[PDB]
Write a protein that binds this ligand. Sequence first.
Ligand code: JUK
Ligand code: NAG
Length: 377
Amino acid sequence: SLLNSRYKLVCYYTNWSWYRPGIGKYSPEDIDPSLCTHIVYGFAVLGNDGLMTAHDTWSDYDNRFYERVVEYKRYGIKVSLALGGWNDSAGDKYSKLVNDPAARAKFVQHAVAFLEKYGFDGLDLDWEYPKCWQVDCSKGPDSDKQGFADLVHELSAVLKPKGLLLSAAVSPNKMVIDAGYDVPVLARLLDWIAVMTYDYHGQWDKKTGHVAPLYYHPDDDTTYFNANYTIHYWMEKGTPASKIVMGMPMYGQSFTIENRGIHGLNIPVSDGGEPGEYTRAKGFLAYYEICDRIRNSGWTVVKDPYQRMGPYAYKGNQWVSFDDVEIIKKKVNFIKSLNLGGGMIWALDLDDYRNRCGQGKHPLLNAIKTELLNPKI
Ligand SMILES: Nc1c(C(=O)NC[C@@H]2CCCO2)cc2c(=O)n3ccccc3nc2[n+]1Cc1ccco1
Ligand SMILES: *[C@@H]1O[C@H](CO)[C@@H](O)[C@H](O)[C@H]1NC(C)=O
């Protein structure tokens, strides 16, 4: 089993996946406890008073979603609560917090009490990102780095004596890593660092690209927008391999291409792809939306024979890049080869947990688990 293996498999749960129609609805009891060593609940948010608070009281509290996910401790899974996320990182509120020692001190004691009230095993920090707020490095002060490092120390100093876990989800981008993270401090204090080795490319690039390349590709604009560079860079900056879990996407980035006629990488794009009927977000498709388009709507799939990145698929002016089982196995062999702490997925509710595509339930996540448990590298 994963729990008895040397690897973690950190699974993100999202409370908002409840608000999806038909088979896209996901609830706490849809979690498969054989597929995760750790579950991280996304998300709590930073309140206006500088204290962690529930994002969705109707689900988190009134419908006991926190309790229903903390339920999985009964299987030996560690269940943490994540603070932040992309949407909660839009403004200056996390920067204001971390740059204020008195505000940090108030936040830390309340946060630990919050975790203990609901039975969580730890806190996961998901500020995206210190200094580079929503990736814009011009927005925040350099002191976000020291402030975040001190927040991590102050949290660790309270959580660790209580046997509670502290982790962070972190950027894969060299410039954001350089600007936002005191890597030795984080590496020493955090129980794991979930490197978000995805969203390297998307509609914001104005051209097609892969959500999550593993290795450099000769046509890349940079040498650093791939998981191999990112993971080695976290280690070069001072992170032990055992502290790293490598993120893998259960979704794709979608694009509306300017011209039906060319359908390859790095081709001009006019907008995000049309929203999926379940996830309802321009530029984003769950794996179970992508596999259905391939299986039943005739989308054409292009694979990389050198397996530096997963496939992309297209039809008409729609184009999506994503990870299939084949590239997932390659990525997990990469995790094992570097002796990393394990793997991480964003997110449980985006894999084909209903077996809509006939590959079996949870095809991507089961591929990760099987490869992690395979002793050969
Ligand atoms: N919203 C987002 C999101 C996102 O976290 N979740 C989407 C949700 C989540 C659940 C359901 O689908 C991530 C990124 C991102 O990693 N970026 C990286 C580098 C540069 C820009 C950028 N922008 C992002 N944006 C804005 C965006 C761009 C175009 C349209 O929106
Ligand atoms: C992965 O990265 C390392 C260090 O950056 C590099 O030496 C190696 O060649 C890369 N692997 C590739 C490009 O397949």
